């Protein structure tokens, strides 16, 4: 039962700093390395850092020298990075992942386990609210057969928007899209439910449509016009 | 352990003690790293002949 | 540095159909490399280290080979968990990955449902119109859409996001909008899309009159 946690969510400006921790369970904290890696959105694996939770000594990948900080705490089982002077560029899911305890080679860093992720952002703006509009087609005429109808999400910076059709009773034939960045470095999605063409005049949709950071949450009807 | 512990460029991990004041009684265990005077000098500092 | 080349950007097969996927080095690692698959969503799992030994728990038509400078990780058959993507490390001087090897199953060839929504009255109230184009259930993911205003072309103002590959029939759906200034929009008359995808055999187009 070896459970690896990482530190939630955070949200940080251009050239400040970012202290991610990972909580060890299940097995001696002090029996191998932990590996740090970090993930860019639709991009490659990236190693930068390891540290003997026994030892203290500590080793990097070369671009993150001078920037990236390892330490860890025995009595707390918890190893932590601590990241300075962050590029934008610097946004990415990052990971702690544990070196081979058992059956393997003596020098060889695997990642046998690896944490929740947690999902640092690096930006200019500061937390928005979204703003959501209906999407529908032309009149009603220019519709034929079967139909689409749907929720355009527009302006909101703290990332993980969550989008919902009559509060969850409807659940099939739906589509919500991986969000965009602007060039405000604002976040937009879409969300689109395909339905066939009569029930538009018998049935009414609500989308619900949250945002964590800002705690705020909206209902609004997509009515055809 | 040729097969778990070598490398093809050559694996430095592992070391053994080649000085000492005094030999170790049983099972002790030495986590010493302070310098070796070989010679009747004294010496101070990380190294010397 | 230790560069990890992988040659396939992304693989499309069928079950029951066998995967090769390989990883190369800039010099010989002799044995020093080990093989990761990442599923949509959820954190990457260790499948082969030292370029052949299997992990514990892991089905064993997974298999890995080579040795000096190039190494293959291979499937029997990609039955519909192993989709995802696909990474290489070395040992033997740093952690280094390869380039991220995606899964696609192959299904039958499927044209886009198509359409058009025009700004809402909510966005004449905010004073922009992100005008959006819509492409669904098709299935070669390469669906080019394209944009074009009084049948004058567009460019450089449109974003476009497509989802992961379905469980549901194997297919892809993709939102494409174009970002107009009142200032634009309350000019022009006609607003197009247009589809080039595969499963088409000729371009095909959803249009709408500003006011209409
Ligand atoms: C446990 O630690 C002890 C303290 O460091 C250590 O005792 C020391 O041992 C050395 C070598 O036997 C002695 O070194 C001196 O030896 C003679 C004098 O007996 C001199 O001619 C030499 O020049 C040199 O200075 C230390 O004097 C001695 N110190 C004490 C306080 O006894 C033990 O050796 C260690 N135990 C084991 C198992 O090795
Ligand atoms: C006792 O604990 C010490 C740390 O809590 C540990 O010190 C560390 O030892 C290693 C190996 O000797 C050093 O590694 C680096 O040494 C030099 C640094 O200039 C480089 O040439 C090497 O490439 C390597 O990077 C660490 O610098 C050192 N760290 C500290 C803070 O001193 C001891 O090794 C432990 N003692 C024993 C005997 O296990």
Redesign the interface.
């Known amino acids: 039962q070896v459970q690896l946690v990482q530190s939630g969510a955070e949200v940080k400006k251009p050239g400040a700093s970012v202290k991610v921790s990972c909580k060890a369970s299940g097995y001696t904290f002090t029996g191998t390395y932990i ?1 740090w ?1 970090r993930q860019a959105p639709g ?5 930068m850092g ?1 540290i003997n939770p026994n030892s203290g000594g500590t080793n990097f ?2 671009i993150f020298q001078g920037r990236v900080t390892l330490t860890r705490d025995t009595s707390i089982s918890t190893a932590y990075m601590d990241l300075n002077r962050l590029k934008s560029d610097d946004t990415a899911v990052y ?1 702690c ?1 544990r070196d ?1 305890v058992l059956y ?9 386990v ?4 947690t999902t640092v952002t690096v930006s200019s703006a500061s937390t928005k609210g979204p ?1 959501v ?7 009603r005429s ?1 519709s034929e057969s ?3 109808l ?1 929720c ?1 999400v ?1 302006d909101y910076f703290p990332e993980p928007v969550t989008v919902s059709w009559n509060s969850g009773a409807l659940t099939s034939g739906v ?1 919500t ?4 960045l ?1 060039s405000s470095g604002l976040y ?3 969300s ?1 439910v ?1 339905v066939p063409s009569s029930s538009l005049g018998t049935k009414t949709y609500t989308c619900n449509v949250d945002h964590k950071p800002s705690n705020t949450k909206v209902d609004k009807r997509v009515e055809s016009k | 352990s040729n097969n778990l512990d070598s490398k093809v460029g050559g694996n430095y991990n592992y070391l053994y003690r080649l000085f000492r004041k005094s030999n170790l009684k049983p099972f002790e265990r030495d986590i010493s790293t302070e310098i070796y005077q070989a010679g009747s000098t004294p010496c101070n500092g990380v190294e010397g002949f | 540095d230790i560069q990890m080349t992988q040659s396939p950007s992304s693989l499309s097969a069928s079950v029951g159909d066998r995967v090769t996927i390989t990883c190369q080095a800039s010099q010989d690692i002799s044995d020093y490399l080990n093989w990761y698959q990442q599923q949509p969503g959820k954190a990457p799992k260790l499948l082969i280290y030292d370029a052949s030994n299997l992990e514990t728990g892991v089905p064993s038509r997974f298999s890995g080979s080579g040795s000096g400078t190039d190494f293959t990780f291979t499937i029997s058959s990609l039955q519909p968990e192993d989709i995802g993507t696909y990474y290489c490390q070395q040992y033997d001087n740093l952690p280094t990955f390869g380039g991220g090897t995606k899964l696609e199953i192959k299904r039958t060839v499927a044209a886009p449902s198509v359409f058009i929504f025009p700004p809402s009255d909510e966005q004449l109230k905010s004073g922009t119109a992100s005008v959006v184009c819509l492409l669904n259930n098709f299935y070669p993911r390469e669906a080019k859409v394209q944009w074009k205003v009084d049948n004058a072309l567009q460019s450089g103002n449109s974003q476009e996001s497509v989802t992961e590959q379905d469980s549901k029939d194997s297919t892809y759906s993709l939102s494409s909008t174009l970002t107009l200034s009142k200032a634009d929009y309350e000019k022009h008359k006609v607003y197009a899309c247009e589809v080039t995808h595969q499963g088409l055999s000729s371009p095909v187009t959803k249009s709408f009159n500003r006011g209409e």
């Open positions: 590996h890696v991009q490659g694996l990236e190693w390891w990948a070369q990971y992942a081979r393997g080679r003596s020098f060889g860093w695997y990642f046998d690896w944490g929740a992720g703003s509009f209906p999407l529908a087609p032309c009149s220019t079967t139909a689409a749907g355009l527009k589509h899209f991986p969000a965009v602007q937009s999605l879409s689109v395909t």
